[PDB]
């Protein structure tokens, strides 16, 4: 504590969080970026926004935050506030309506070698195209593009920590199953600025919907109405209740439309399979 | 020694972010404005709100932050927090939720020659009076009005940005490769205009703003499949009542009044979607 107090006072006596933490301005700050998916909160088909709970692990070296443990009682690692130090400004480029950057400023683990590890939490509300063609049997490949907003690849380089996101602490989802996940790095250089590449890391998740809820709540009543539709042709005309049966099946389907709109998403990107079945049943009646 | 630190101390040791970068009070600061739209999230008919994801391209000159790359080891760009530099304070005047400023205060890029670039991203919820007459086969004219919350036209003025070809970007910029069209709305046009008013002697100090008019077209597929076609068929069913016999077992009044009941159910359904 006294050793760490003295060390922190020495470190932040003339520290600057404005400039990049490099010995020479011609050096590059390498940032190892690792995304951990903790939870898949929601998939919004109407607004095309996937909400996730993530830990965005970031690792980089700070040249000025170095010390010898022998001069400070053997202190080899410490925790300091992240707001006091320079950090990369990773931004979710496909942010729909959430936060673009990190807002929860947790503490960084600082090694005596200058190595920083910062693992803040974030709620990523990301915008991805939601193909509803095969709904509720639909598969959705949704990506999260991450990159340094104000720094280019020539001054700050970013690399993935691993080829795949960390799903070790992922909570089981009751609506989606993550079939595949992969983190790809991309570099784009423009002819106007040939010496300043712009880098990003895009994590994509291929997810398959679990359709039992919609099968039980939507498909089975529609099947029952479809079966009941043809029974009027076995009902004799002398009963005087043919129109009663047919029009009341129509009334039941019309009331069930309220449940249909309540349950399924409402979007005009395409006609869902469940919507096609609803329209088929209605034309049938 | 990092040369970035030396440049930062040279520029910012004697610098006031509260003062405009003008040598005289009556000089005007010119702001080059570009607005890039990333995603059109939603248009809430009930609240009459348009939610969009944008980032604003802001460029201007600051003679106080002017440096030569030769003197400072060849540095052509410097990233500093936006709170340390003067800003024109561009706000969305027609926001409906009370959020005027940008979502993330990104760093400003200070280039050599006094050129300052700021590219902050923003989420805006703007007023859009929904023209309900032809709903759902309707198009809207949502506006995004940008202005300086502090400075008048004589103090700060706006100009449109120019691309590498040199033409003026008098519209909303959209990156085609990165743009995913909204599921319900298609953006057709997006002109931009710089307006000036209150500039008369009787009016007093002049005022200016930039207005972007998003012309958006609704895709009526959901309403066509789910509401209009079933309602049309059910409303056509009453014509079948003319062919049923006028006897006890005809069920003529059965078919007619139950079609009315289904129409009432559709009224309840439609009341949840239409504007108020």
């Amino acid at each position: 504590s006294e050793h760490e107090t003295r060390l922190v006072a020495k470190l932040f006596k003339d520290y600057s969080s404005v400039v990049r933490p490099v010995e020479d301005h011609r050096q590059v700050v390498e940032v190892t970026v690792g995304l951990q998916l903790i939870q898949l909160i929601n998939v919004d088909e109407v607004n095309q926004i996937v909400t996730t709970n993530v830990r965005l692990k970031q690792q980089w070296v700070d040249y000025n935050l170095k010390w010898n443990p022998d001069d400070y009682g053997g202190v080899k690692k410490i925790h300091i506030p992240s707001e006091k130090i320079w950090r990369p400004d990773l931004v979710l480029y496909n942010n729909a309506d959430g936060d673009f950057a990190i807002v929860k400023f947790t503490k960084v683990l600082l090694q005596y070698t200058g190595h920083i590890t910062w693992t803040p939490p974030a709620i990523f509300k990301s915008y991805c195209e939601i193909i509803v063609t095969h709904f509720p049997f639909d598969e959705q490949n949704c990506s999260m593009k991450l990159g340094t907003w104000t720094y280019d690849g020539s001054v700050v380089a970013i690399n993935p920590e691993s080829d795949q996101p960390d799903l070790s602490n992922f909570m089981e989802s009751g609506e989606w199953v993550i079939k595949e996940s992969r983190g790809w790095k991309h570099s784009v250089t423009y002819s106007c600025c040939p010496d300043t590449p712009y880098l990003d890391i895009t994590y994509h998740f291929v997810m398959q919907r679990l359709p039992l809820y919609f099968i039980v709540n939507v498909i089975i009543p529609c099947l029952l109405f479809s079966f009941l539709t043809g029974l009027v042709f076995y009902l004799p005309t002398d009963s005087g209740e043919k129109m009663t049966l047919s029009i009341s099946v129509l009334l039941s389907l019309t009331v069930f439309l309220l449940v249909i709109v309540e349950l399924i998403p409402s979007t005009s990107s395409a006609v869902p399979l469940i919507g096609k079945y609803m329209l088929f049943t209605m034309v049938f009646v | 020694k990092n040369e970035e630190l030396r440049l930062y101390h040279h520029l910012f040791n004697n610098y006031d972010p509260g003062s405009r970068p003008v040598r005289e009070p009556e000089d005007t600061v010119t702001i080059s404005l570009k607005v890039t739209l990333t995603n059109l999230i939603s248009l809430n008919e009930k609240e009459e709100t348009l939610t969009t994801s944008v980032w604003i391209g802001i460029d201007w000159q600051d003679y106080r932050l002017n440096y030569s790359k030769d003197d400072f080891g060849g540095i052509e760009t410097l990233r500093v927090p936006s709170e340390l530099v003067w800003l024109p304070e561009i706000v969305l005047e027609n926001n409906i939720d009370g959020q005027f400023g940008v979502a993330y205060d990104a760093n400003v890029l200070v280039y050599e020659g006094g050129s300052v670039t700021w590219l902050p991203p923003a989420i805006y919820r703007s007023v859009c009076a929904v023209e309900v007459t032809y709903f759902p086969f309707d198009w809207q004219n949502c506006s995004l009005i940008f202005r300086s919350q502090t400075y008048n036209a004589e103090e700060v003025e706006f100009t449109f940005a120019v691309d590498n070809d040199g033409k003026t970007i008098n519209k909303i910029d959209i990156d085609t490769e990165a743009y995913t069209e909204n599921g319900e709305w298609a953006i057709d046009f997006c002109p931009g205009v710089i307006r000036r008013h209150h500039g008369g002697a009787t009016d007093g100090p002049g005022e200016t703003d930039v207005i972007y008019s998003l012309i958006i077209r609704r895709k009526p597929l959901f309403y066509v499949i789910n509401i209009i076609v079933p309602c049309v068929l059910i409303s056509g069913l009453v014509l079948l009542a003319y062919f049923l016999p006028a006897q006890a077992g005809g069920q003529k009044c059965t078919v007619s009044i139950n079609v009315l009941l289904a129409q009432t159910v559709f009224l309840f359904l439609i009341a949840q979607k239409i504007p108020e």
């Epitope: 010995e23 011609r26 590059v28 070296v61 070698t113 190595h115 | 060849g74």
Partner: antibody
Framework: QVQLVQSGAEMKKPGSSVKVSCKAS????????IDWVRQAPGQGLEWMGG????????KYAEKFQGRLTITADRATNTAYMELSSLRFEDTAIYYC???????????????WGQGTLVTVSS | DIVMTQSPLSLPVTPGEPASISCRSN???????????LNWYLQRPGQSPQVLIY???NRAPGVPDRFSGSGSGTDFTLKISRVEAEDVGVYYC?????????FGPGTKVDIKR
């Protein structure tokens, strides 16, 4: 103090492959800032290859293309080289030169390994 | 490849008086941003090489203040304020601009007697 420790000396024959490591301690190193330099007996230094952020991939000399593979592991703070199809003239002391923070389009080599003698002889 | 040469091939020195080494390239090493990519390396007898000056003017961390460097687009110089007994070895100049990077033939140094 930052120290680079290379693998041990190796005795090889023509046509075989030698893999030399370069392990770092006392500091943190990344995916870039690695260069391998050999010194034959009674001859000067010669650059073999390395990794720079400009290319994001290793670049080798014309002599070593197809035979040399250079890699750097950020997680374990070590780098490797793998030279295949060894010849008699490849006998030399092989060094690793590294920088904690790499330069974009060049290299400096502030920290050097102790050098490993690879002797190719039948 | 860019050809790099140094002079003198062998320089006797006495401790307590300055010294100078020179290196020359067959192409201008000037970068577009305005700095010259030329590094100097010292290999003491039996030890690994040590960087002395990088980019032709910058003293590396941990290097004594004696070693200084300067140069132009094609000609570069390395100077020692006052030679010490520990400064004996082979000095190499290296360009870091164009792949393949090339070291010089190397300049030898020894105590004069």
């Amino acid at each position: 103090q930052v120290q680079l420790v290379q693998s041990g000396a190796e005795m090889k024959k023509p046509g075989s492959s030698v893999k030399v490591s370069c392990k770092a301690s006392g500091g943190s190193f990344g995916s870039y800032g690695i260069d391998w330099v050999r010194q034959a007996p009674g001859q000067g230094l010669e650059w073999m290859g390395g990794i720079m952020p400009k290319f994001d991939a290793p670049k080798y000399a014309e002599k070593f293309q197809g035979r040399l593979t250079i890699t750097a592991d950020r997680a374990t703070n070590t780098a490797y080289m793998e030279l295949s199809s060894l010849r008699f003239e490849d006998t030399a002391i092989y060094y690793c030169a590294r920088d904690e923070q790499p330069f974009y389009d060049s290299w400096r080599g502030l920290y050097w390994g102790q050098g490993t003698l690879v002797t190719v002889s039948s | 490849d860019i050809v790099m040469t140094q002079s003198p091939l062998s320089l006797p020195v006495t401790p307590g008086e300055p010294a100078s080494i020179s290196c020359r390239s067959n192409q201008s090493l000037l970068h577009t941003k305005g700095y010259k990519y030329l590094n100097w390396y010292l290999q003491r007898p039996g030890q690994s090489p040590q960087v002395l000056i990088y980019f032709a003017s910058n003293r590396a961390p941990g290097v004594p203040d004696r070693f200084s460097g300067s140069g132009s687009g094609t000609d570069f110089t390395l100077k020692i304020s006052r030679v010490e007994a520990e400064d004996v070895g082979v000095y190499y100049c290296m360009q870091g601009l164009q792949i393949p990077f090339t070291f010089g033939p190397g300049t030898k140094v020894d105590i004069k007697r």
